[PDB]
A = this chain, B = another copy of it.
Amino acid sequence: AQGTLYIVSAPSGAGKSSLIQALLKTQPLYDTQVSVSHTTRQPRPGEVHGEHYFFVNHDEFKEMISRDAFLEHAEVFGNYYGTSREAIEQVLATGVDVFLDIDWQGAQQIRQKMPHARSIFILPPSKIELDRRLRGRGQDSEEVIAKRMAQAVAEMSHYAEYDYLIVNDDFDTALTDLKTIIRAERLRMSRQKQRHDALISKLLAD
């Protein structure tokens, strides 16, 4: 019937976006999808329009805030980002789970708006590695990294507001962790009661 919203947040460099992406590779569109956000920030190298993000002017965005197009929006690390209402509501009507790769501010917003949403915070094994991971993928640059690490602390302090916590120490353990959370929620009685309406009905008979 209705699918489930999965908020996922982390200090930049924890590897959250790379986890969510590896997960969807093993997950068909009919079960799981991700929301593509709008944002003012400049496209990094080898980042196409309409896949990772929808890239729009600070002008275009201030007007989306106005036309009320966003389920949530916020300022993080000096730029505007947002999750458009139209897309999300459609996909969720079709029983498909949708992932939101958003910050703590966005998460707080979605939690009032959509109270059945589930949220996962991902932590690094140390701030020393948070910095190392950032430099290690050639996406981002010197100025931008120091900016993000200043807030890395403040980001991580919101961890307790989330339903689930993953320490991404080692990428493959972490991906299993995330796969599991999804798998286990799909074994909850509400959801399994629909998907096996078929079976149950015949079981209870002769």
* Chain A contact residues, CB within 8 Å of chain B: 13, 15, 18, 22, 25-31, 94-96, 123-129, 132-133, 135-139, 153, 156-157, 159-160, 162-167, 169-173, 177, 180-181, 183-189, 192-193, 195-200, 202-206
Contacts and interface: CB of A to CB of B under 8 A. Distances in A.
Given A125-B195, A165-B193, A96 B136 contact: yes
25 contacts: A15-B28, A15-B30, A18-B30, A28-B171, A29-B136, A29-B138, A31-B136, A94-B132, A95-B136, A123-B200, A123-B203, A125-B198, A126-B203, A165-B187, A165-B196, A166-B187, A167-B196, A167-B199, A170-B173, A170-B186, A180-B180, A183-B184, A184-B184, A198-B202, A199-B199
Contacts of A156: 203-204
A18 B166 CA distance: 25
Contacts of A185: 184
B94 A202 contact: no
A171 B31 contact: yes
Contacts of A186: 170
Contacts of A136: 29-31, 94-96
Nearest to A183: B180
Contact of A195 (B129, B184, B189): B129
A185 B183 CA distance: 12
A184 B180 contact: yes
A186 B192 CA distance: 21
Nearest to A121: B189
A192 B165 contact: yes
